[PDB]
Nucleic acid binder design. Structure first.
Lengths: 122, 63, 81
RNA sequence: AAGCCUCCCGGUGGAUGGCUCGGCUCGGGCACCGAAGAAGGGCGCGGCAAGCAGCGAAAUGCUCGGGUGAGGCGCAAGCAGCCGUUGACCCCGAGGUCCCCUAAUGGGAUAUCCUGCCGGGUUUCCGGCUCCCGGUUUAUAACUGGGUGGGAACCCCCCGAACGGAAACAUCUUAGUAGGGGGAGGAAAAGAAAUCAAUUGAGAUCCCCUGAGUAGGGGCGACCGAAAGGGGGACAGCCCAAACUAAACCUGCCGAUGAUAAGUCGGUGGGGAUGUGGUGUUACGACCUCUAGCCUGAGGUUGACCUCGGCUUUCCUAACCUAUCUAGCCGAACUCCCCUGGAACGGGGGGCCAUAGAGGGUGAAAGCCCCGUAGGCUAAAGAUAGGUGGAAAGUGGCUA
RNA sequence: AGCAAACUAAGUACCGUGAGGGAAAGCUGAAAAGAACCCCGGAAGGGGGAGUGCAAAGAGCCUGAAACCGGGUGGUUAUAC
RNA sequence: GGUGCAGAUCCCGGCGGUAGUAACAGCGAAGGGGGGUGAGAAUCCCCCUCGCCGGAAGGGCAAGGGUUUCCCGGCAACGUUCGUCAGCCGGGAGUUAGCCGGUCCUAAGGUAGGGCCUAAUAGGUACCUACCGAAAGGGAAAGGGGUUAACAUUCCCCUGCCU
RNA sequence: CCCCAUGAAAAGGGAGUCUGGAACGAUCCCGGGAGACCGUACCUAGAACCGACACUGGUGCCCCGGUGAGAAGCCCAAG
């Protein structure tokens, strides 16, 4: 019951409010994680380990060190490019091009949110 | 220095003097104009928001 | 009520030479009490008060202390000097 | 040499092509704000802050609940610092603060600025201060309690042109238009026949399709112009003055009871015989009064009379329950092999989902990468609607 | 073009004593990786050599027409439209 | 269907030719020598000299402007040429009153509320009440010497005066 | 001296004459305290105002040794 106009769809994703920006960061879990967590997707936070499925660096796996929640991109340690002077800068990859390999289970409010999303028993 | 719930314990007299102390240390912090190189510029904002909290608690005591 | 203390090059020369202080106050235009606002906050005695309104939205007071008190000690306490 | 024509390269320039968080038209919802100070404006507020947006000396934001889960400090990427896992930012609900002008309202402003008199605590500061109405107090003194302005269009009422057309122009038309003044609402206005039409019929008002450019008006010129009836949409009806009664009546404040409501009881004040309350409002007749005669329950009295139990109209809201709204949440199926390529969302091969193949994003053209979609679920607190619940008054029918 | 207003401030700037009138202006790239360093220059998103990128019409940034101007190719020119 | 342009003294944008041409004279002023700074001086700075105004080209202050004022640093644009300079551009600052003026009074004149009028008012107004109307009219009381880069009958010192 | 010109009004000042009241009491000397609020920089013009402009226009008012009647024309101080 929402509009199918392309301009109305794009005005939502460019002006998304703070509490709803987690949708831009959603990524698929690895097959082993979903065995022991019972969910298929989750939003990404700093400290997760992430592997690329698309791009010129496919197969590269590291750890998330930065997020850009307004555009939906992440920065991975060791995936850099050097500037003119030589200081490295990060390569940003969209959250839909990666698959999550391990989580950081230390929030205690992220964990029961995962359980609330119907992890099997505990 | 973010007091939120000990202010409701104090009485109307103690809040008057705590308000005066904060208004004096905010006057001293305005040496940032004097280029006195405030290390933490965020203390002017933090102090102005503690003054607002006290005036809220004073009002809640139906003053 | 007092808002800031002015510490420009004219304000510094007046502390040392005339024993006066320069403050920016609210322009509440019903004034009896800048005299007893400073006499209470700093425990000094005031002799004369001359007031002004700058062209950029401020009200500036030239408060002159008595000889028994030094404006340098008030300034030093605030960290101006 | 001045040169001349043609093509190439460059400059200058910004057409062409492609793109789009902007417009434009329709459908559907929803619909008043203000003396408890509105709409509109002016000045302020950020560590460095000029503008926009947000906010008001508690000023780039304060408090309490709910949702969310790791970052946050707007457009806007710097220097420096801080807030947050004791749950921030952000979203929803409820509160606090809320400068000056402004209907502007104590008095004045060609000063968005000045300046009073009473009452209260008492630095600050906070309340009261034209035209009417119902009261108090000695009588023009003083005091208690109660319309004004705004809104894009739409609506009701008064005042009210010319240009133009008539092939000139004055009656006429344009036109009760444009415009002016006053008054509202979420709709206004109209509205229960002193109506229509025609052999005795219909039955309040309003809107649509018609009747119809018909009847009819007019230098009978240009031109102007119905209603009844037919088909539909919605389709309600009361209440007063009067006859008969004659204080049986209304209302402010205080106390109790009642869910702080309506109401009941008690005490004080203002009204009211120049009429408050009851009955009663329609037409080959209606209503009222008296007399005579026939018709639920209980009771009394002399088949007859009278008194208490159904019905009609009106007043009321809290507790409880239910549904909806203000928010968020669940939601299928490939990121398999080879080639091109900066990057597959492309080509070739293989597979899967579908109540979902609307649309969007992602390094190219994606049902299966992500958001969403078809389809489902949610709320401590407010808001709305319904149910449940409480009370007051007035009351026979028929025939002559 | 679409509302006058797609943009650093639209009834904004600006014009009028006033009632009032009323503009212009979009686009680097997938990612700033926004050109380190060396020579010239007073300086200049200035010149040259480099380097980044699939690709520099590289900040005056998509594509980049014509008019106009400069350089070059091929014909030709001071006895005649 | 908002559908085909050479014309509308068409509308808007860009660009020619005139042409590196006119103008930068006229209103009664004028420069020269030596030195400096700077990447770069007819044009900015220093010294000497020469010329012009002298009832205005000097001094003091309004309405109006609104930061143009003062210090430091600049030169892409701005100034009829140049510019190292500036009323321009960037960064900092600056206006102090019992005695000065407003504030008060009334003038010519106006307004609000009542009355009277108006179909009505945002309309008229002879009357009543109140208020408004002058920074050159009326209107209590101060002078000197000094002090800043920028204020001074306003700040300091001495001597005063009004209510 | 002149007019068929007769040439502002108020707040605010001072004084006088009376009436009432108290016996303490100054318009004279000495000492002490107080006197809100708002304006104030700069130009004021052949470059700061208005005229589209750093416009020969307009807006200004008040003031200023020799020769000579002179605020004229000519020459020169202060600036």
């Amino acid at each position: 019951m929402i509009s199918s106009k392309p301009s109305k769809q794009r005005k939502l994703v460019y002006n998304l409010p703070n509490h709803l920006r987690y949708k831009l960061l959603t990524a698929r879990l690895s097959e082993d994680l979903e065995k022991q967590y019972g969910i298929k997707r989750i939003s990404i936070r700093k400290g997760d380990s992430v592997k690329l499925m698309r791009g010129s660096q496919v197969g590269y796996e590291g750890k998330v060190v930065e997020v850009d929640r307004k555009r939906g991109r992440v920065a991975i340690e060791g995936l850099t490019k050097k500037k003119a002077d030589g200081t490295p800068v990060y390569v940003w990859v969209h959250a839909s091009k990666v698959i999550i390999t391990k989580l950081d289970t230390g929030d205690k409010e992220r964990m029961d949110a995962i359980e609330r999303k119907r992890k099997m028993r505990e | 220095p973010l007091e939120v719930d000990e202010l409701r314990k104090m009485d109307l007299k103690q809040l008057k003097e705590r308000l005066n102390e904060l208004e004096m240390q905010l006057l001293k912090l305005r040496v940032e104009s004097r280029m006195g190189t405030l290390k933490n510029t965020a203390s002017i904002k933090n102090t102005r928001k503690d003054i607002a909290r006290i005036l809220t608690v004073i009002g809640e005591k139906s003053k | 009520i007092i808002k800031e203390f002015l510490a420009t090059e004219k304000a510094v020369k007046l502390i040392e030479s005339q024993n006066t202080l320069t403050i920016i106050v609210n322009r509440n235009t019903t004034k009896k009490d800048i005299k007893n606002e400073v006499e209470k906050l700093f425990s000094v005695k005031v002799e004369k008060i001359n007031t002004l309104i700058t062209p950029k939205g401020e009200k500036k007071a030239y408060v002159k202390l008595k000889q028994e008190y030094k404006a340098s000690d008030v300034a030093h306490k605030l960290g101006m000097l």
